[PDB]
Coordinates of N, CA and C in Angstrom, one line a residue:
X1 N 6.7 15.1 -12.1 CA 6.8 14.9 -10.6 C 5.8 13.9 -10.1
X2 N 4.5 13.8 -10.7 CA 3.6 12.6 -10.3 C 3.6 11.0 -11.1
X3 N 3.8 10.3 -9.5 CA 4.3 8.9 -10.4 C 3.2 8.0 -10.6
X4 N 2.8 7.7 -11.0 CA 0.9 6.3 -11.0 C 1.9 5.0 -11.3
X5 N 1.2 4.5 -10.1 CA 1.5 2.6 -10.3 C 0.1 1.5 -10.0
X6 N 0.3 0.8 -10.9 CA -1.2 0.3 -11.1 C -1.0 -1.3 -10.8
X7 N -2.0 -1.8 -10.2 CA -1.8 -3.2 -10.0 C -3.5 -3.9 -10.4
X8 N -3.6 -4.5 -10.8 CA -4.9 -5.9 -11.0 C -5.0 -7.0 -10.0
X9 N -6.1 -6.8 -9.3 CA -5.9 -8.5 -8.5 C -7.7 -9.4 -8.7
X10 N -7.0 -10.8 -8.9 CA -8.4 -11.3 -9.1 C -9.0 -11.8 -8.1
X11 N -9.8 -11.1 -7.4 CA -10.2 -11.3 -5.7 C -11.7 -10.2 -5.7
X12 N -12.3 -10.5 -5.1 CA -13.4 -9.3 -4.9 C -13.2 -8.2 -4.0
X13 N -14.2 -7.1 -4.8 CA -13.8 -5.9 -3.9 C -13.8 -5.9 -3.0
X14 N -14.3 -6.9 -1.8 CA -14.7 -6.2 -0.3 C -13.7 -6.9 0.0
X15 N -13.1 -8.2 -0.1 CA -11.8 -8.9 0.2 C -10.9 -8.2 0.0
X16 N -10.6 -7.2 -1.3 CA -9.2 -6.7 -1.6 C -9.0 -5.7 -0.9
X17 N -10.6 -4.7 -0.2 CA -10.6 -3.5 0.3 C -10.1 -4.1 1.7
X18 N -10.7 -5.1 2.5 CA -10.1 -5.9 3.7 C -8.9 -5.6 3.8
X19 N -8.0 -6.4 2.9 CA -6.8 -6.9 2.8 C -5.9 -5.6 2.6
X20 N -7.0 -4.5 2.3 CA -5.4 -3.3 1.9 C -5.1 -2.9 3.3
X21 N -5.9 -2.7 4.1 CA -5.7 -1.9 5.8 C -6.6 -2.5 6.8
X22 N -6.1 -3.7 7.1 CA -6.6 -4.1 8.5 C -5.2 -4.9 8.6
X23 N -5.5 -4.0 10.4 CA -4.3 -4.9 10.9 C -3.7 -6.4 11.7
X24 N -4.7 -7.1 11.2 CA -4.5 -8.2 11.3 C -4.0 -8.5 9.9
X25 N -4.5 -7.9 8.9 CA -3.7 -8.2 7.4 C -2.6 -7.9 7.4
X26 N -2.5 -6.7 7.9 CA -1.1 -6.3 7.7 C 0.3 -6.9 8.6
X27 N -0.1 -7.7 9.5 CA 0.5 -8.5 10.4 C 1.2 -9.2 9.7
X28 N 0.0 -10.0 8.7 CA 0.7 -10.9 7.3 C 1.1 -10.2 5.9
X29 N 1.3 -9.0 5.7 CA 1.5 -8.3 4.9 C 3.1 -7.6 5.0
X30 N 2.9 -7.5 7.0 CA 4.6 -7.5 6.5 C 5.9 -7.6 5.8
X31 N 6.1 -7.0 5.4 CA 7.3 -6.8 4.3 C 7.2 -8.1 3.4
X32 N 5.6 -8.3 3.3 CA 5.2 -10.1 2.0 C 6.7 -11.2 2.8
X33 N 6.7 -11.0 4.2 CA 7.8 -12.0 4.5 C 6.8 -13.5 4.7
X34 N 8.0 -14.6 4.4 CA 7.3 -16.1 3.9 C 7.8 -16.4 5.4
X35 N 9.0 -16.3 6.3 CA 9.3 -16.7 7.4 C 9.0 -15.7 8.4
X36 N 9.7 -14.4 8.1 CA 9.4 -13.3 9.6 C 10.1 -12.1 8.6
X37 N 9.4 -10.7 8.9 CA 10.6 -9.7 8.7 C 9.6 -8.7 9.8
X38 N 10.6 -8.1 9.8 CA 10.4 -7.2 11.5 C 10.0 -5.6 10.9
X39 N 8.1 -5.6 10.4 CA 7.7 -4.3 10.6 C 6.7 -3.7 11.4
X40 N 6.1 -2.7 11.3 CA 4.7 -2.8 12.3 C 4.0 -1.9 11.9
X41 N 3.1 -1.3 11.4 CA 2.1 -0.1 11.3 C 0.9 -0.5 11.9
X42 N 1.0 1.0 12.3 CA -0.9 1.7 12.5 C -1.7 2.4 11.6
X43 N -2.8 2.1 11.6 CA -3.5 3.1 10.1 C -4.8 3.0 11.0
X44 N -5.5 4.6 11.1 CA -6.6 5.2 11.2 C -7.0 5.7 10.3
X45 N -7.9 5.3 9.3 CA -8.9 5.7 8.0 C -9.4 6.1 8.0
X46 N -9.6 7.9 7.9 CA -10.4 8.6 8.2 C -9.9 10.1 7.9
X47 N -10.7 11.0 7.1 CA -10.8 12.3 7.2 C -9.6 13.1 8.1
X48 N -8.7 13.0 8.1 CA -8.0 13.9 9.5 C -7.4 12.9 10.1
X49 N -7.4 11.4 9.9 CA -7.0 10.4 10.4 C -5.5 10.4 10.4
X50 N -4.4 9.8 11.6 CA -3.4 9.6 11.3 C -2.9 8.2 10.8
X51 N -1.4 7.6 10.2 CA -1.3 6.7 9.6 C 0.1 6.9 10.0
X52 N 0.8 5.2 10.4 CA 2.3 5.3 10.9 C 3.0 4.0 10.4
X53 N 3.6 3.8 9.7 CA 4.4 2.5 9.3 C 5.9 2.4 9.2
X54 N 5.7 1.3 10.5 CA 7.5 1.5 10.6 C 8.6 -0.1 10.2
X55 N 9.5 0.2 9.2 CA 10.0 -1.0 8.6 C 11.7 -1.4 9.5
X56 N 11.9 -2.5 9.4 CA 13.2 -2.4 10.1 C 13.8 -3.7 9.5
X57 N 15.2 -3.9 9.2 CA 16.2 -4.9 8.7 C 16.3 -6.3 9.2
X58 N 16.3 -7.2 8.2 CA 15.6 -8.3 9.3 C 16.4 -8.1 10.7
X59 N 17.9 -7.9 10.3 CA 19.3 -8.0 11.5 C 19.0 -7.2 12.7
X60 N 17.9 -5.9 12.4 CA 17.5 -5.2 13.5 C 18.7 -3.9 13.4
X61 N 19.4 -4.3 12.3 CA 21.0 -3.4 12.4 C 20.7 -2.0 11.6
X62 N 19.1 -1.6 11.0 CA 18.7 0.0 10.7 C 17.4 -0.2 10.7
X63 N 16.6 0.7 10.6 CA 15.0 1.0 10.2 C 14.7 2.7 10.0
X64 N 13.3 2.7 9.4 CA 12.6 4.2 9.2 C 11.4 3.6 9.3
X65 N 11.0 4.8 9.9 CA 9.2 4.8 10.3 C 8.9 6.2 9.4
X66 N 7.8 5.9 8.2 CA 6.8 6.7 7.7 C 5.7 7.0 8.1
X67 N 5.3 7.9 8.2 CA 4.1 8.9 8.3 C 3.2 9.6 7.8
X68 N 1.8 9.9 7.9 CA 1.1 10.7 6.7 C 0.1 10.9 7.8
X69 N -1.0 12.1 6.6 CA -2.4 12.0 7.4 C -3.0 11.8 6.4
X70 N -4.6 11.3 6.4 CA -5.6 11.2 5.8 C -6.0 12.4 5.9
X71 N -6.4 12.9 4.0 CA -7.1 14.4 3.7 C -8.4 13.9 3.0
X72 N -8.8 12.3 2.6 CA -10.1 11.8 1.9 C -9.9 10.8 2.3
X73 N -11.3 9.9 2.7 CA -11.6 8.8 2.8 C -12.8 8.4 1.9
X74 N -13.4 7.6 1.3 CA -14.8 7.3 0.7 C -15.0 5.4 0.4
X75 N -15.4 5.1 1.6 CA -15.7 3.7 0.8 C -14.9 2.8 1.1
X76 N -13.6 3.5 1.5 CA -12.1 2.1 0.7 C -11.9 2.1 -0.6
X77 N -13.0 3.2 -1.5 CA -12.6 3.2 -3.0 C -11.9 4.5 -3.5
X78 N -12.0 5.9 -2.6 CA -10.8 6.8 -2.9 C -10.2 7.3 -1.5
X79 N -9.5 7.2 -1.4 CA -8.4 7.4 -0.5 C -7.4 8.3 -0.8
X80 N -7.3 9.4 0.1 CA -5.9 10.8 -0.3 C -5.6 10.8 1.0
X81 N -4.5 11.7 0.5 CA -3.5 11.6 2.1 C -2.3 12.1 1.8
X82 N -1.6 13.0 3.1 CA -0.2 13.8 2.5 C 0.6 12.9 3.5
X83 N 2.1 13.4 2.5 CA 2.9 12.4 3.3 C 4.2 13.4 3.3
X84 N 4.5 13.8 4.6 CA 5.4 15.0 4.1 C 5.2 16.3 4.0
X85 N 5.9 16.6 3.2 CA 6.1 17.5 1.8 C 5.2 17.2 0.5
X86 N 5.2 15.6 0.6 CA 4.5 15.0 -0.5 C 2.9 15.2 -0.1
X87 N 2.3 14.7 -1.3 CA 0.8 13.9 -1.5 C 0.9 12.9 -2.3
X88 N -0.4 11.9 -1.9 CA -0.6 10.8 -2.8 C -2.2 10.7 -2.5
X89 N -2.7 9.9 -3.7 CA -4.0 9.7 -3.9 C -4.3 8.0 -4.2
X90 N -5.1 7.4 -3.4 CA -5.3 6.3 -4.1 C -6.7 5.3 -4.7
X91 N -7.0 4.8 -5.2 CA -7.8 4.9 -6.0 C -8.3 3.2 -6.4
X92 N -9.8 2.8 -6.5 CA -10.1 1.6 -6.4 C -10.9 1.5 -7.4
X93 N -10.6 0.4 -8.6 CA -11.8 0.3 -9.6 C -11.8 -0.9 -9.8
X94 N -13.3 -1.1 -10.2 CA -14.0 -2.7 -10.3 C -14.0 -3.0 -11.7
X95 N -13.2 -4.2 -11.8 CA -13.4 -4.2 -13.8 C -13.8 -5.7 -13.1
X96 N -14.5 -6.6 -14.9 CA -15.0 -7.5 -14.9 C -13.9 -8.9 -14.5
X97 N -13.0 -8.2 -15.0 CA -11.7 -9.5 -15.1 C -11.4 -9.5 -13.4
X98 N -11.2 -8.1 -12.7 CA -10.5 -8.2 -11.3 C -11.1 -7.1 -11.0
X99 N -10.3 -6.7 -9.7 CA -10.0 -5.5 -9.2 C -8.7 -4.9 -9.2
X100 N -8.5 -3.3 -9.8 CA -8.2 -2.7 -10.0 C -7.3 -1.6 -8.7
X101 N -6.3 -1.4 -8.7 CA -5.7 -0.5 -7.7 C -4.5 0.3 -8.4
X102 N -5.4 1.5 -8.6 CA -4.1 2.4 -8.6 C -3.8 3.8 -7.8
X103 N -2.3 4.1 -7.9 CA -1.8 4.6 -6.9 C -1.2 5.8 -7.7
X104 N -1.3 7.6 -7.4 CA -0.4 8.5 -7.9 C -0.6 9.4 -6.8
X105 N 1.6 9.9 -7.0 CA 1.9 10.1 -5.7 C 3.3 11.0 -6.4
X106 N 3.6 12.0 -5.5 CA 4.5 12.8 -5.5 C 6.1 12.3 -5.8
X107 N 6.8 12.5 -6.2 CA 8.3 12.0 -6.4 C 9.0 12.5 -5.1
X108 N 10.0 12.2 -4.8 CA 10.7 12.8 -3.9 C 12.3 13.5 -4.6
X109 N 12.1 14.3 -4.4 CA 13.5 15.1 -5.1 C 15.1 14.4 -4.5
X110 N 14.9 13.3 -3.3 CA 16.3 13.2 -3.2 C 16.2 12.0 -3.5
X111 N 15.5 11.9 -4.1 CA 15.3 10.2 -4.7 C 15.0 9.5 -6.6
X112 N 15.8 9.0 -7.5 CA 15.2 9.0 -8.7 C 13.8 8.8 -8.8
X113 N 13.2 9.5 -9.8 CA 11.9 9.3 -10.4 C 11.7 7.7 -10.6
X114 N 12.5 6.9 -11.0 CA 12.3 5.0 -11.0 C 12.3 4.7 -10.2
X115 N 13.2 5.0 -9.2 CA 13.5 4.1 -8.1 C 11.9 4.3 -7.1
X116 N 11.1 5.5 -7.2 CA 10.1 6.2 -6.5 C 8.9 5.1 -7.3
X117 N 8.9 5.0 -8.6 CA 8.3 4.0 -9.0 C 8.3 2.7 -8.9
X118 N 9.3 2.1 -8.5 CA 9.3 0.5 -8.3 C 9.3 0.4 -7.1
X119 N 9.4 1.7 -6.2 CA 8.9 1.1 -4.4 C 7.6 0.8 -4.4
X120 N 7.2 1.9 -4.8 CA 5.4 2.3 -5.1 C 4.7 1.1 -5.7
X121 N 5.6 0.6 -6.7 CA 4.8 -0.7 -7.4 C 5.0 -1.5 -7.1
X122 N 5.7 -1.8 -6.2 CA 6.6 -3.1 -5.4 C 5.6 -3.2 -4.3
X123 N 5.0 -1.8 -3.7 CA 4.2 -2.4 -2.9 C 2.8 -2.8 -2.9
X124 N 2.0 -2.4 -4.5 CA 1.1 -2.6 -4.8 C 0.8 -4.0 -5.0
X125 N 2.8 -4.6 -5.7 CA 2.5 -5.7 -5.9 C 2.6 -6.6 -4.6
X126 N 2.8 -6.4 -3.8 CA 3.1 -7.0 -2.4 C 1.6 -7.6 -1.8
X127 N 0.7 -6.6 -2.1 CA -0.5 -6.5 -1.9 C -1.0 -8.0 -2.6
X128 N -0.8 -7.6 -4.0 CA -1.3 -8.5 -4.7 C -1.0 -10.1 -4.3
X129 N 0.4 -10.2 -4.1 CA 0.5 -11.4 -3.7 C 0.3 -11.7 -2.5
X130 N 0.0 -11.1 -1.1 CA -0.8 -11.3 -0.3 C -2.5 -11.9 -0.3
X131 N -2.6 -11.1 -1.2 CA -4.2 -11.8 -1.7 C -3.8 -12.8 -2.3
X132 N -3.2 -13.1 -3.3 CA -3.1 -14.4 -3.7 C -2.9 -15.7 -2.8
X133 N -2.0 -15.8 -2.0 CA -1.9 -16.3 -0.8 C -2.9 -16.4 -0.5
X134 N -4.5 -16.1 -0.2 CA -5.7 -16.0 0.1 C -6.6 -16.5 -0.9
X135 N -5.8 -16.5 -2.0 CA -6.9 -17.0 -2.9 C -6.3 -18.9 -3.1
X136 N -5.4 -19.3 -3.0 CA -5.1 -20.8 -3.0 C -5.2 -20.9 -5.0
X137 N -4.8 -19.8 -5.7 CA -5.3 -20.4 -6.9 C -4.6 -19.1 -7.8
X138 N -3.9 -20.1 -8.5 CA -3.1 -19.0 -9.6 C -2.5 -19.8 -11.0

């Protein structure tokens, strides 16, 4: 039932911790769109903190808004939080080559075990190429 998705980016920690939740990042982090895609979140980082991210079609013709609360904060280097029914935990490690992000997180029963994995890592990688974009160099 717990799914871990891991991503590497070659950027420094205090850049990559920036770039995971501030909302001016996230402005440009929207759905990693190169022209426009139409989403919006709030994130309050914190102990008991709430967190709201809502995605919508470019056409405007469906959307869903997700929600969680923060149950750990430390640093920007461990991060927990339930989402639902669910939990997830997320997690920051400094290796020589990069920085390190990994993510494990509850499955959802009305949804395949893969498909729960390649959103999860789809968005880690989303991240990643957002920082790249920031780095001018690949």
């Amino acid at each position: 039932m717990n799914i871990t998705v891991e991503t590497t980016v070659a950027a420094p920690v205090g850049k990559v911790w920036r770039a995971y939740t501030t909302p001016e990042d996230i402005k440009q982090w929207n759905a990693a769109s190169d022209d426009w895609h139409t989403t919006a979140a709030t994130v309050d980082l914190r102990e008991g903190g709430a967190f709201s991210s809502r995605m919508e079609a470019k056409d405007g013709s469906m959307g869903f808004d997700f929600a969680g609360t923060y149950t750990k904060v430390v640093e920007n280097k461990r991060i927990e939080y339930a989402f639902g029914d669910r939990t997830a935990k997320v997690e920051f490690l400094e290796a020589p080559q990069g920085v390190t992000v990994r993510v494990s997180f509850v499955a959802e029963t009305e949804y395949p075990v893969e498909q729960q994995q390649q959103g999860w890592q789809a968005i880690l990688n989303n991240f990643k190429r957002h920082v790249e974009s920031h780095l001018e160099h690949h």
